Amino acid sequence: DHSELLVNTKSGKVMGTRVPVLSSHISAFLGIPFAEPPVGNMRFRRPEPKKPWSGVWNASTYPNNCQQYVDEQFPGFSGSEMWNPNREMSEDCLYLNIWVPSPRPKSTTVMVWIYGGGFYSGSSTLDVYNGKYLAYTEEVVLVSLSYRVGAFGFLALHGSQEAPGNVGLLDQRMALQWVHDNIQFFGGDPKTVTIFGESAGGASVGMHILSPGSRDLFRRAILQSGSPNCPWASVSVAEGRRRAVELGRNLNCNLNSDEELIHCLREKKPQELIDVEWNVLPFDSIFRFSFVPVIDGEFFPTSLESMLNSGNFKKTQILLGVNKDEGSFFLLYGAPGFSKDSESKISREDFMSGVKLSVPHANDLGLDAVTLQYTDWMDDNNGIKNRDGLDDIVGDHNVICPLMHFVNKYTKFGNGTYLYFFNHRASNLVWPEWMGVIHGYEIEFVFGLPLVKELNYTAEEEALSRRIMHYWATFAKTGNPNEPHSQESKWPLFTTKEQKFIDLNTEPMKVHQRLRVQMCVFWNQFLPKLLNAT
């Protein structure tokens, strides 16, 4: 038995399937197990490596998606539905997927995609994460992994080895171990693995850069609209403890010991956990999630900010950036006065309420500083300015400014930073105009969807996708997104002194400096000082 669709790995033999892509074909190996099913009494534990198997693992179909909350705010609307599980859910969900050029390469660049979803949702199997276009067009081996989300991935009772926290990040790490150990059999070079992801996936990428136990498993990294230091992406062990206890309380559990709490939570069916998980948040807010990574002293040896300041992280090249209207999604879903089928002009009063929801940690003085920094006092009742102002508050506070802080710290010690600002509003977007360039909507350009006629993008969008795909792949290959010696415009390196970045859109490249500095000085220096003093 020796064929293109048959691969022998250290865990055993695997059978792929041949897959059409833009008038050609490539191989796909879908649903490969990298870990033991984390079911029964393994619920909440560290993952275990998958036991090698006899025979041939059938990898022709997508695996199950992890157990997660399902978005029903817009039943049947494609814009929301493109993010929900398109496969059955199960706790048996630790699989990865691989798309390989045909003919099988010998030793080519590997890209491993880590999905977002606020650490409580996400799937490797979504249509927007289909690796075939990028594998095919850029001649890379494209992997996507999966990882436990919600309580299953992130319930944390520090001190306990039954539910220690961060096990979803350990799931990701185990897949990356598997790729390190086995991708060579698929034609990938384990020495040139780029990890990439968006949102919590981007945060996850930054987290593997920081964690000593993950760093050696990859060469380079791309972070899309997420940063490990984002306010939503981690909590203290005391806060983790609190939430787990509270989750127990919502389920009539026995709170007397870690063991009694865990035993009870292990008896529950998955949906029972998911039905009450949104009831454990400390504040009334938006852009905050229930079970997330914990600063535990192990996966993360000290606080994220101390790791960044001292240079305790992997030094390599990174390519990263943000979308123009990162806040709009979260306002739609979580804040009063924003709705899908209206222009969502906002009163002064739904503004003040938006602010309080957006910065739950802030005292009154704090809320006043935010309000002043984002209100045009010559025109304080323009419902549009208020809407846009809140959009910018959410985006700047939760995504952009944390990313800019990560960038400036990393770049001091790292070996090459490329920064972008994606500001192209897709011509076939189904969400309303007010939402602008939405969190998550660069992905489709990164995975090459606009090259598919039927999906109704313009030609200039096809070209923008090809250009982005080629920057990301060239970067994964070399640590630099620019082709040596081509005549195209050059994406310059981001340096501590000059802080250059480019826009990503259908217009001639333009280079700028100091991405939102005015607001990021407010969010990164002034406001935390205000809140620590008062």
Ligand X SMILES: O=C1C(NCCNc2c3c(nc4cc(Cl)ccc24)CCCC3)=CC(=O)c2c(O)cccc21
Ligand Y SMILES: *[C@@H]1O[C@H](CO)[C@@H](O[C@@H]2O[C@H](CO)[C@@H](O)[C@H](O)[C@H]2NC(C)=O)[C@H](O)[C@H]1NC(C)=O
Ligand Z SMILES: *[C@@H]1O[C@H](CO)[C@@H](O)[C@H](O)[C@H]1NC(C)=O
Question: Could you list the residues that contact ligand X (CB under 6 A)?
Answer: 71, 79-80, 83, 116-118, 121, 198-199, 286-287, 329-330, 333-334, 431, 438-440
The least CB distance from residue 333 to ligand X, in Å, is 4
Peptide bond into 103 cis (omega under 30): yes
Count of CB atoms within 10 A of residue 456's CB? 11
Count of CB atoms within 10 A of residue 483's CB? 13
Residue closer to ligand Z, measured from CB, 6 or 372: 6
Residue closer to ligand Y, measured from CB, 324 or 477: 477
**Catalytic member of 80, 204, 439, 462:** 439
Phi/psi for 29 (5° steps) reads -125, 110
User: 25, 24, 3, 22: which is closest to 14 by C-alpha?
Assistant: 3
Residue closer to ligand Z, measured from CB, 183 or 426: 426
Q: Where are the alpha helices (DSSP H) in 193-311?
A: 200-210, 237-250, 258-267, 270-276, 304-310
User: How far apart are alpha carbons 198 and 124 in whole angstroms?
Assistant: 12
Return the one option of ligand Z, ligand X, ligand Y, none that residue 199 interacts with (CB less than 5 to 8 A, by type). Answer: ligand X
CA distances to 83, 120, 180, 404, 435 from 225, rounded to whole Å, are: 16, 17, 26, 10, 16
Return the one option of ligand Z, ligand Y, ligand X, none that residue 61 interacts with (CB less than 5 to 8 A, by type). Answer: ligand Z
Per the CB < 8 A criterion, the answer to whether 326 and 399 are in contact is: yes
Q: Kindly state the DSSP code that residue 482 receives in the 8-state scheme.
A: S
Return the one option of ligand X, ligand Z, ligand Y, none that residue 81 interacts with (CB less than 5 to 8 A, by type). Answer: none
* From candidates 455, 483, 496, 514, binder to ligand Z by CB under 6 A: 455
User: 408, 348, 423: which is closest to 380 by C-alpha?
Assistant: 348
User: How far apart are alpha carbons 518 and 499 in whole angstroms?
Assistant: 14
Return the one option of ligand X, ligand Y, ligand Z, none that residue 334 interacts with (CB less than 5 to 8 A, by type). Answer: ligand X
Return the one option of ligand Z, ligand X, ligand Y, none that residue 500 interacts with (CB less than 5 to 8 A, by type). Answer: none
* From candidates 456, 458, 489, 495, binder to ligand Z by CB under 6 A: 456
- Specify the amino acid at residue 516: R
Residue closest to ligand Y when measured from CB atoms: 415
The least CB distance from residue 495 to ligand Y, in Å, is 8
The least CB distance from residue 439 to ligand Z, in Å, is 21
Residue closer to ligand Y, measured from CB, 216 or 460: 216
**Catalytic member of 326, 444, 461, 462:** 326
Per the CB < 8 A criterion, the answer to whether 17 and 27 are in contact is: yes
Residue closer to ligand Z, measured from CB, 87 or 467: 87
User: How far apart are alpha carbons 190 and 18 in whole angstroms?
Assistant: 23
Q: Supply 393's token pair.
A: 């508050």
Return the one option of ligand Z, ligand Y, ligand X, none that residue 117 interacts with (CB less than 5 to 8 A, by type). Answer: ligand X
User: How far apart are alpha carbons 7 and 25 in whole angstroms?
Assistant: 18
Q: How, if at all, do strands 24-33 and 417-422 pair? A: unpaired
User: How far apart are alpha carbons 317 and 214 in whole angstroms?
Assistant: 16
Q: Is 48 a catalytic residue?
A: no
The least CB distance from residue 427 to ligand Z, in Å, is 11
Q: How, if at all, do strands 318-323 and 417-422 pair? A: parallel
Q: Supply 426's token pair.
A: 């897709």
* From candidates 257, 381, 415, 458, binder to ligand Y by CB under 6 A: 415
Residue closer to ligand Y, measured from CB, 302 or 415: 415
Q: Is 439 a catalytic residue?
A: yes
Residues 9-38 that bind ligand Z (CB under 6 A): 15
Residue closer to ligand X, measured from CB, 52 or 282: 282
Q: Is 259 a catalytic residue?
A: no
Return the one option of ligand Z, ligand Y, ligand X, none that residue 416 interacts with (CB less than 5 to 8 A, by type). Answer: ligand Y
* From candidates 117, 416, 436, 440, binder to ligand Y by CB under 6 A: 416
**Catalytic member of 121, 124, 199, 214:** 199
User: How far apart are alpha carbons 65 and 127 in whole angstroms?
Assistant: 13
Residues 53-112 that bind ligand Z (CB under 6 A): 58, 60-61
Phi/psi for 325 (5° steps) reads -125, 60
Return the one option of ligand Y, ligand Z, ligand X, none that residue 121 interacts with (CB less than 5 to 8 A, by type). Answer: ligand X
Return the one option of ligand X, ligand Y, ligand Z, none that residue 330 interacts with (CB less than 5 to 8 A, by type). Answer: ligand X
What is the sign, positive or negative, of the torsion defined by CA atoms of 155, 160, 166, 168?
A: negative
The least CB distance from residue 520 to ligand Y, in Å, is 23
What is the sign, positive or negative, of the torsion defined by CA atoms of 157, 160, 166, 171?
A: negative
Residue closest to ligand X when measured from CB atoms: 440
User: 304, 287, 288: which is closest to 395 by C-alpha?
Assistant: 287
Q: Does 513 bind ligand Z (CB under 6 A)?
A: no
Q: Which residues bind ligand Y (CB under 6 A)?
A: 415-416
Q: Which residues bind ligand Z (CB under 6 A)?
A: 15, 58, 60-61, 454-456
Catalytic (active-site) positions: 199, 326, 439
